[PDB]
């Protein structure tokens, strides 16, 4: 219940730890370990995450979480605390711990519960989740924030199915990018990696996140990842197999040397998803194609995508989640920093 003061690496950390009680383990994996706890002062459920930092790469979880904590964005986790603990199996190891609010599920697990029981997720849940995921990157990509997550995947998109809410987390791989400065192209889970990253480009933009989001939209409607390659070239083959071979000019723009594959005509979305009951499939598929453009600049930007006709029914107070609950109150609650950068047409539609 109490966190063990003896595991604090220092006084500051012992004092932060005393704010929280541990209820139980929530999940463990390659990233580290997430415990469900409570803030003792408010009762609030928290995720206490013990961060495992791969020394081959730059981990920016704490610094990016601190920059985002100023915004209070309804679709991004809010840092509550950070502190350092000694390792369980070897006390010479010290770990960063970040505390944020707890969200009960991942989008991966929520979708997998439907597919495993032979049901596709309800269309209105896919739609409300997508709206929120796009809003989360909208916020990250603002000029005032300039954060590229670079590892968006169903496993770090958090959801509460009961109230239709969604939050983005897991910012260890995130970075503010500049066209002047180079980056590591091998970031992101291979299945969600944009073509410019498959090509090993060291200069790339926040549009890599848009690709990842499109990939997730497809996976929510398919039940498995849409582009499943065994390697970088395998990944391009799978993309080209589904979307069709782009022109040589497009391939030359993406290939850094600017100077090689089957000429697939691509599969229509209708044959990929086989969902004849989806009443607005045409809109859904238009949106998907607008996110999954080969050239980064051609991809639909988040605030334009929020105004896409696929999302029209989210404006109707009569629209309900599958359990008959109202849509989340915060869907159309925008931050001043978001509103002040919108076009007049986007403000009219969304605010």
Ligand X SMILES: Cc1ncc(-c2ccnc(Nc3ccc(S(C)(=O)=O)cc3)n2)n1C(C)C
CA distance 278 to 257: 43
Catalytic residue from among 7, 151, 170, 209: 151
Q: Are 96 and 61 in contact (CB under 8 A)?
A: yes
According to the binding rule CB under 6 A, does residue 100 interact with ligand X?
Answer: yes
Q: Residues with Cβ < 8 Å from 169, sequence gap 6 or more? A: 76, 77, 100, 103, 156, 157, 158
CA distance 145 to 154: 23
CA distance 210 to 194: 9
Give the 3-state secondary structure of residue 164. Answer: coil
DSSP string, 294-316: SSGGGSPPHHHHHTSGGGGGGG-
Which of 99, 185 has the CB closer to ligand CAC? Answer: 185
Which of 46, 128 has the CB closer to ligand X? Answer: 46
According to the binding rule CB under 6 A, does residue 38 interact with ligand X?
Answer: no
Give the 3-state secondary structure of residue 144. Answer: coil
According to the binding rule CB under 6 A, does residue 77 interact with ligand X?
Answer: yes
Give the single-character DSSP code of 108. H
The count of residues interacting with ligand X (CB under 6 A) is: 18
CA distance 313 to 236: 35
According to the binding rule CB under 6 A, does residue 110 interact with ligand X?
Answer: no
- Structure token pair of residue 32: 């580290």
Write out the residues near ligand CAC by the rule CB under 6 A: 57-58, 175, 183-184
* Residue number with the smallest Cβ distance to ligand CAC: 183
CB of 3 vs ligand X, minimal distance in Å? 17
Q: Which 134-163 positions form the footprint of ligand X (CB under 6 A)? A: 156, 158
CB of 338 vs ligand X, minimal distance in Å? 22
Among ligand X, ligand CAC, none, partner that 58 touches (CB below 5 to 8 angstroms by kind): ligand CAC
Per the annotation, the verdict on 326 as an active-site residue is: no
Which of 17, 103 has the CB closer to ligand X? Answer: 103
* Residue number with the smallest Cβ distance to ligand X: 27
CB of 202 vs ligand CAC, minimal distance in Å? 8
According to the binding rule CB under 6 A, does residue 52 interact with ligand X?
Answer: no
According to the binding rule CB under 6 A, does residue 31 interact with ligand X?
Answer: yes
> What residues are labeled active site?
151
């Amino acid at each position: 219940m109490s966190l063990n003061a003896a595991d604090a690496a220092d006084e500051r950390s012992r004092k932060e730890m005393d704010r929280f009680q541990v209820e139980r383990m929530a999940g463990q994996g390659t990233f580290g370990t997430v415990q469900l706890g409570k803030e003792k002062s408010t009762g609030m459920s928290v995720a206490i995450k013990k961060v495992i930092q791969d020394p081959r790469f730059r981990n920016r979880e704490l610094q990016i979480m601190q920059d985002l904590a100023v915004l209070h964005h309804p679709n991004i986790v809010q840092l509550q605390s950070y502190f350092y603990t000694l390792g369980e199996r070897d006390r010479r190891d010290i770990y960063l711990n970040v505390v944020m609010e707890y969200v009960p599920d991942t989008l991966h697990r929520c979708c997998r519960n439907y597919y495993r029981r032979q049901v596709a997720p309800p269309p209105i849940l896919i739609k409300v989740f997508l709206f929120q995921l796009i809003r989360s990157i909208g916020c990250l990509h603002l000029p005032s924030v300039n954060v590229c997550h670079r590892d968006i995947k169903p496993h770090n998109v958090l959801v509460n199915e009961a109230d239709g809410t969604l939050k983005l987390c897991d910012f260890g791989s995130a970075k503010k990018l500049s066209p002047s400065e180079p980056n590591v192209a091998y970031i992101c889970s291979r299945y969600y990696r944009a073509p410019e990253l498959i090509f090993g480009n060291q200069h790339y933009t926040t549009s890599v996140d848009i690709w990842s989001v499109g990939c997730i939209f497809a996976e929510m409607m398919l039940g498995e990842p849409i582009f499943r390659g065994d390697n970088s070239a395998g990944q391009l083959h799978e993309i080209v197999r589904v979307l069709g071979c782009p022109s040589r000019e497009v391939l030359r723009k993406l290939n850094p040397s600017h100077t090689d594959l089957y000429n697939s005509k691509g599969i229509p979305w209708s044959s990929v998803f086989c969902d004849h009951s989806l009443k607005d499939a045409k809109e859904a598929y238009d949106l998907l194609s607008a996110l999954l453009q080969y050239l980064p600049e051609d991809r639909m930007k988040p605030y334009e995508a929020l105004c896409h006709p696929y999302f029209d029914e989210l404006h109707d107070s009569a629209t309900k989640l599958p359990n008959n609950k109202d849509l989340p109150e915060d869907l159309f609650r925008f931050l001043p920093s978001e509103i002040e950068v919108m076009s007049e047409a986007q403000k009219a539609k969304l605010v």
